[PDB]
Design a protein around this nucleic acid. Structure first.
Lengths: 64, 201, 144, 117
RNA sequence: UAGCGGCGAGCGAACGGGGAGCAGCCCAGAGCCUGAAUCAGUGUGUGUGUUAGUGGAAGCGUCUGGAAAGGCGCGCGAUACAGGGUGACAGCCCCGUACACAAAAAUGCACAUGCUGUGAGCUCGAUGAGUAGGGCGGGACACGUGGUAUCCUGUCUGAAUAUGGGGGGACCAUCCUCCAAGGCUAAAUACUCCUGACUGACCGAUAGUGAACCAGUACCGUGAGGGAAAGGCGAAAAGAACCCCGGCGAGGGGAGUGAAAAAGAACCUGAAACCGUGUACGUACAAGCAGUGGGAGCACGCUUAGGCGUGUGACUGCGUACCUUUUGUAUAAUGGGUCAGCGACUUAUAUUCUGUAGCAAGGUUAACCGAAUAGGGGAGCCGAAGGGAAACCGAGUCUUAACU
RNA sequence: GCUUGACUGCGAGCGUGACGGCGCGAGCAGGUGCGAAAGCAGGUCAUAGUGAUCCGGUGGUUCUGAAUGGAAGGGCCAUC
């Protein structure tokens, strides 16, 4: 028994150089036309995973 | 770093790294424990509750008797039908790194030098395979508990010491860490010193 | 040096928790697991990523991107590795015989990540700007 | 390696049953009852090493008050007189002088009466 | 990992690389010359076995002792000091062991050679049709119909013939590679009802097989089926001649055997719960988790007084068990009649962190070979470079027309 | 009255959240509007008018394209 990756986590998080994870922001798939352009413009670039969620992300991604 | 001989009176020159380094206690202990662990045979088993001979039916029904609830005559807390975490046959061998094994051999063989437990002779053999000749020969050399190590593997010396338990005979290839510590004296051939100094460096 | 005089280094051989051995071992009566609930049960504990019934973070966030299949056959070469090519020429396959890139690699690059102090003919590889300057400074030659 | 338990279990039971001698009934015969009895005797020994000092202090003060009223002064006036004379004799020794040497205790009472006024 | 997936839980390749092992042939067809290599059954001399077995070295004296193999003093054998037994611990007493042998008779195993069924070599031809493919419906491929290649087909249809056909992950063109719709084929791999040898940081009678024992038995069930408890005298039966009580009892007391009957068969050791006999002390006017602190008297050892040990404990202060569960339990909440024995955080494989050890910009091999814990094997893995969805660039990169 | 700043790429620093997020924002660059001009304008006096992910639909972008040239499918961006 080798550990299996949560394969839906390997498609949403990518590992950076210090060992963090980048992910795409939520709220940018559909009803966009009521959202302001400042909000969607900030939702375009990728962000890092916060401190409380890193334990969950590392447990979901042992080989990343 | 110069090893004297015992009976030829003509010395020998060895490497300073092999026979003259510090004795690493923890490295030698890890390699001795690893040898003794890989010497173990791991052939044992018991039966779990899935493997005891018996039926898998409930002995008395769940509610209504005066008894505690049970589900199997093969329960581990019942007599005749126990072991909870029963053993399987397993392999107890440990991994030793190549450099760690050689550093341990260099440390123990350096201590066999410095504690006056190493003898180097030109040739150590016997003309006919009889243990009485080697008994008289080792009583001549004041050797009681002895490990002979020879460069080329000999047959007459292997038969002349097969019956003796205080005596052991090895090749320079067949050295192991736990026997160079076990025996009192280690008698190397000069060819065996050359081959060990090649094999370890 | 006898077999009853060897001993490990201190801090090498910590014992291990034995759970459920009385008041005075610190780990009797439930042994570190606390009282009742799913975690103290035998075989219990929730799976990886379960945040309650709340939508977990790997399912909360969107998916992005694709896998190239071209980036699985592009390796890279440090400048402290082409002092190992056995001859002083760098090809697509003498790196592969010096065991630095791997057999399924077809495309490769040399990157400024060290020092090179020998003439090397780098042939058939892409080269970065600083690596090209640091190879042409040491008396080499970069062709296509 | 299988470990039988019987010898060390028997030793651990015999220690508790040896510390339970004198007790009534199953408290000196039965390990389950004798273990609780031995732990309860231990709690009592801990509590009563404190209780002993209090009880002996009570007895010393009762005998000092008895002999002081035999000599015509109360306890509180007598201890006031031994503080106002700087006399550091404790209450164990004052009770011992009150029992065994009544003339020396009369001398101490006269000292405390002269110091009291 | 790529992918598949209410893109959830999970499922999970291949290409390529290192090893073990390596072997290719036949028919769809007419002839030359007949038996020339290999496949299956059958007599017969030889090799290795398995099936009986044979030889196989070396010690005595003395003390405790029931008994010597033990202590003590001295020799000897060893290609043999594996193991077991012998009145206690045996290399030298017996069985054996290492080593060397031995089969009238049958049989296994690769070849030889004799019989039989089968066919060497070669000119020239030919090349597996209700098939491939397709429509509908299912199934298998890691692949759940998705853009889905490929394989099998229940049902319906249906080609071409090396100038032809299949595949290369929808599909088309080029190019590469192979020739379906007929078959056989050792090795490396899987398992142990059984046999023989050896081994065990495996168990030692509640354990180890359910079964150390006349055990799948006694017993239970109509039946399928279930399923026990139960080992030990001694070195040797020398297993108590005989006598007395008693019912020509059971049981006992002697005598006798023995080292021992504190081994007599209800038999080594003989624990605890439990039940008695005797002795010392206490107890019939005194209230409760039965103890603890103080403490008189008594009994018995003391030293040659000394106010201390051991046992009991009148009287007195304090003191409502244990566990679990709870905000909270003397609780009239749970659980335990007691004793003895067994009874619960383990094992494998991965991954991260800590300690410790080795080497260090390197570290380390796995399968396997093996002169088998060595040595070889670097196939691989992790790390020294990141950024980006990606092409790509790289100590930088992305965002953007470029960024304060 | 005139107009489209109800722009595009960003964003010093903050606020508020367990997080997912939500919010305020000088100033930079490109282009515009009104005003003579300093200026103001990245929606509305402010605080409600909302819905993650997956799966897919539409347009743009040869970024990828399972031998190669394409293509399907995928990615990114805008959006349902």
């Amino acid at each position: 028994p080798k550990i299996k990756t949560v394969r839906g986590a390997a498609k949403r998080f990518k590992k950076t150089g210090k060992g963090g994870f980048k992910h795409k922001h939520a709220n940018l798939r559909h009803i966009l036309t009521k959202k302001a352009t400042k909000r969607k413009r900030h939702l375009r670039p990728k962000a890092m995973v916060s401190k409380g969620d890193l334990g969950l992300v590392i447990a979901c991604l042992p080989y990343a | 770093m110069e090893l004297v001989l015992k009976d030829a009176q003509s010395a020998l020159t060895v490497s300073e790294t092999t026979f003259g380094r510090d004795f690493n206690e923890a490295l030698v202990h890890q390699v001795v424990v690893a040898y003794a662990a890989g010497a173990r045979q791991g052939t044992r088993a018991q039966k779990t509750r899935a493997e005891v001979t018996g039926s898998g039916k409930k002995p008395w029904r769940q509610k209504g008797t005066g008894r505690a609830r049970s589900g199997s005559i093969k329960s581990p807390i019942w007599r005749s039908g126990g072991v909870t975490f029963a053993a399987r046959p397993q392999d107890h061998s440990q991994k030793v790194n190549k450099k760690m094994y050689r550093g341990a051999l260099k440390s123990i063989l350096s201590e066999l030098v410095r504690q006056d437990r190493l003898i180097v002779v030109e040739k150590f053999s016997v003309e006919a395979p009889k243990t009485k000749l080697l008994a008289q020969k080792l009583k001549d050399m004041a050797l009681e508990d002895v490990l002979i190590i020879t460069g080329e593997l000999d047959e007459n010396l292997f038969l002349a010491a097969r019956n003796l338990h205080k005596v052991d005979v090895r090749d320079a290839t067949g050295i192991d860490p736990v026997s160079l510590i076990a025996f009192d004296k280690v008698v190397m051939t000069a060819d065996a010193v050359k081959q060990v100094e090649e094999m370890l460096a | 040096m006898r077999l009853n005089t060897l001993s490990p280094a201190e801090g090498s051989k910590k014992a291990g928790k034995r759970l459920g051995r009385g008041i005075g071992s610190g780990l009797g009566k439930t042994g570190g697991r606390g009282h009742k609930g799913q975690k103290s049960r035998s075989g219990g504990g929730v799976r990886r990523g379960f945040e309650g019934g709340q939508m977990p973070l790997y399912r909360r966030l969107p998916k992005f991107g694709f896998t190239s299949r071209k980036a699985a056959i592009t390796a890279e070469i440090r400048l402290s590795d082409l002092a190992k090519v056995e001859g002083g020429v760098v090809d697509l396959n003498t790196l592969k015989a010096a065991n630095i890139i791997g057999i399924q690699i077809e495309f490769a690059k040399v990157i400024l990540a060290g020092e090179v102090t020998t003439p090397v003919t780098v042939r058939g590889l892409r080269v970065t700007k600083g690596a090209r300057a640091a190879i042409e400074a040491a008396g080499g030659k970069i062709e296509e | 390696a299988r470990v039988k338990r019987g010898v060390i279990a028997r030793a651990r039971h015999k220690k508790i049953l040896k510390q339970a001698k004198g007790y009534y009934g199953a408290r000196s015969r039965v390990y389950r009852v004798a273990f609780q009895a031995v732990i309860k005797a231990g709690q009592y020994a801990y509590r009563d090493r404190r209780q002993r000092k209090r009880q002996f202090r009570q007895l010393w003060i009762a005998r000092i008050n008895a002999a002081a009223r035999q000599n015509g002064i109360s306890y509180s006036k007598f201890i006031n007189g031994l503080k106002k004379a700087s006399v550091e004799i404790d209450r164990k020794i004052l009770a011992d002088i009150a029992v065994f040497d009544k003339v020396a205790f009369t001398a101490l009472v006269e000292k405390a009466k002269a110091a009291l006024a």
